[PDB]
RNA sequence: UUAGCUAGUAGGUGGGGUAACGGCUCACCUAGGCGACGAUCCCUAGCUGGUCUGAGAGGAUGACCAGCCACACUGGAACUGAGACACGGUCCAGACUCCUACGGGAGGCAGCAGUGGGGAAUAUUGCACAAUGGGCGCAAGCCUGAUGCAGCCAUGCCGCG
RNA sequence: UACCCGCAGAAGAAGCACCGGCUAACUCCGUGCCAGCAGCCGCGGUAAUACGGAGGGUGCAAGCGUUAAUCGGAAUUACUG
RNA sequence: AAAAUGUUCUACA
């Protein structure tokens, strides 16, 4: 507080630290699902959350949740994550784009398309 | 085949469906002709309900029928021990484990050689230590713990014995340790088959 | 003259630096491998990075000796130290890329012409 | 949670060396020099004008453009030269790629395009020296992937439909 | 080339996100702690303005969302303070 | 004098 004591020893800034550490500063990362499975979110939750366990290029091996309803990912399925942590799950920091490399869109979905990879329907 | 009805960690309703379902897939292996029958078999806090239960079937179209069952099975119904409670799908897990063993013949083999840790002239000499294998096995002994040859043949003809007991023993340990680990196994989720109110009213 | 506990040095870029002889191949009671010969080696030192690893058990042409080789007009020629190429267990063809340091007329036969081919020079 | 570091080290004399001062170097002498006003060591990093943010003070940052520095396959070295220890010079060594008649040779896109690879991701193997600038030349002119332009991309800003 | 002039004809040219609170914009249907949503608080277990579709509406618009990243809000390292 | 534990989510601007 005093002038003196700053003097010796400055304001140390508090060091934030990312919580999406496997995209090391990168908007997404290509990975390859290790695993595909579900997973029950904690309390007050219920559901089987859909998660994929994703080894990425920069070998960071990390769980990815798979939005939207119904999904073709399957083991060795190569995906991009983009990072949004899914409170509900804990340990969970990143998503799967959908739509992207081998992510299907989310099938006969309207609204909030570009969301979940799906083209515009035509009429 | 030897499927295994589990209420994994859910309530004594998901005990209550498993007694529900496992009455179910009685009547439908009875109409389809196939015999079930229970081997192990535990309860919850309730008579009637059913916290897992081990079966056998038979036949080709038992296979079929495990078809027909194996994954989740879902029920759909309001707690009948709980009045108000909210959650009304109790999951099962329906999984096939075909815990096997075949008793391998008695074709055992002996030879007789000097023992280890002599402790004498005599005993320097004398060849009294029996080595037994068990062929089509790889359980090879060799008992030197008595004065004789006889006498160690005959403790080697037990030990063969007692270590086949011990083959058993483990395999059908890592049987139960694979039951148990079903029980964590089944996710509540995608239901391979779904049955509904309290007298599971579908299929 | 390679025998059984011999160290060799490693005229290859396979990664070992020292390998030993552990088996004379080719025969029964048989003593000692010439140049030409091939050898059963274990590695007993390989660099960090390369394509085969300390402990390895495998198979190797001794290619220098320091023993030597003679010729028909009963020239010899010797080596400073002793020398061979690792080769894999089944094919027994050169695992390295690169052959350091001559060789000699012995190897050329179509078991090891990629090893002459390969070698700077061959006395 | 790196506290001690330093022997050409610090200073002096003299000789040598440099375009020039100088431990720059050498010989000898002295025993110093740096360090809590953080030396040494470790990790990270090109610096700046600036950029973003912020009311400001600050915080973050250094892509483009401009000044400075450094580097030019890796490690060294000098030569030539006003100027280099020199991207498209030399010599040596090394790794890699290639040629070979096996003796021995060749090469260096972090120039512009482009290719493969890596990656979430970043473009054409374009036109022209007409302008500006540069080298050489008396000049004409030649050369100039600087540069001017054009191509591709909503990448951004702005305008319009 | 810019730019100008003429010709034809509304022709050739609108999407993206959101609508429980924060935060501008609400209803119906489907679903029934499932499927799913979610930045946080939280939604969903039959009357869901929160899920998914539709109608409507809101915000932006040749862009719109999401992710990453920095500062801000954070007086939450406070010299100002 | 001695007296331990306790099931579950719970609705209501
Ligand atoms: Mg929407
Ligand atoms: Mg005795
Ligand atoms: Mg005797
Ligand atoms: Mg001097
Ligand atoms: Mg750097
Ligand atoms: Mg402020
Ligand atoms: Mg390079
Ligand atoms: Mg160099
Ligand atoms: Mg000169
Ligand atoms: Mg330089
Ligand atoms: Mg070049
Ligand atoms: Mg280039
Ligand atoms: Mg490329
Ligand atoms: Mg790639
Ligand atoms: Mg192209
Ligand atoms: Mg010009
Ligand atoms: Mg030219
Ligand atoms: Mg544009
Ligand atoms: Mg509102
Ligand atoms: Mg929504
Ligand atoms: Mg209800
Ligand atoms: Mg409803
Ligand atoms: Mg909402
Ligand atoms: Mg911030
Ligand atoms: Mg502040
Ligand atoms: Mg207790």
């Known amino acids: 507080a005093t002038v003196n004591q700053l003097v010796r020893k400055p304001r140390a800034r508090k060091v934030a630290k990312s919580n999406v550490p496997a995209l090391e500063a990168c908007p997404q990362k290509r990975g390859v699902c290790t695993r595909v499975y579900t997973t029950t979110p904690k309390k007050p939750n219920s559901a089987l959350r859909k998660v994929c366990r994703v080894r990425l290029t920069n070998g960071f091996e990390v769980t990815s949740y798979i939005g939207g309803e119904g999904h073709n990912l399957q083991e060795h399925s190569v995906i991009l994550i983009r990072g949004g942590r899914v409170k509900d799950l804990p340990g969970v920091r990143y998503h799967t784009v959908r739509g992207a490399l081998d992510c299907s869109g989310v099938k006969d979905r309207k609204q909030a398309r570009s969301k979940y990879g799906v083209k515009r329907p035509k009429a | 085949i030897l499927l295994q009805l589990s209420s994994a960690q859910g309530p004594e309703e998901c005990c209550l469906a498993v007694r529900k379902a496992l009455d179910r897939l009685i009547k439908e292996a009875t109409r389809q002709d196939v015999a079930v029958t229970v081997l192990e078999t535990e309860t919850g806090r309730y008579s009637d309900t059913l916290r897992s239960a081990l079966i056998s079937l038979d036949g080709d179209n038992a296979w079929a029928l495990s078809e027909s069952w194996c994954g989740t099975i879902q029920w759909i119904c309001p707690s009948p021990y709980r009045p108000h409670h909210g959650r009304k799908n109790w999951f099962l897990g329906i999984g096939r484990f075909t815990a096997d063993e075949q008793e391998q013949s008695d074709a055992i083999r002996y030879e007789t050689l000097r023992s280890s840790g002599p402790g004498g002239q005599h005993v320097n000499k004398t060849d009294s230590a029996v080595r037994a294998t068990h062929l089509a096995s790889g359980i090879s002994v060799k008992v030197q713990s008595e004065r004789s040859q006889h006498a160690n043949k005959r403790l080697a003809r037990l030990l063969i014995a007692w270590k086949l007991e011990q083959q058993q023993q483990e395999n059908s340990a890592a049987l139960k340790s694979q039951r148990r680990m079903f029980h964590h196994q089944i996710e509540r989720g995608n239901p391979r088959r779904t049955f509904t109110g309290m007298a599971f009213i579908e299929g | ?123």
């Open chain 3, 1 to 123: 003259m390679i025998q059984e506990q011999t160290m060799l040095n490693v005229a290859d870029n396979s990664g070992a630096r020292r390998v030993m002889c552990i088996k004379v191949l080719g025969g029964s009671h048989r003593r000692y491998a010439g140049v030409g010969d091939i050898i059963k080696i274990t590695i007993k030192e390989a660099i960090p990075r390369g394509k085969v690893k300390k402990g390895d058990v495998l198979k190797a042409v001794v290619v220098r000796t320091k023993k030597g080789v003679r010729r028909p007009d009963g020239s010899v020629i010797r080596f400073d130290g002793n020398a061979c190429v690792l080769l894999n267990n089944n094919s027994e063809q050169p695992i390295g890329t690169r052959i350091f340091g001559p060789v000699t007329r012995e190897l050329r036969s179509e078991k090891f012409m990629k090893i002459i081919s390969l070698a700077p020079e061959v006395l």
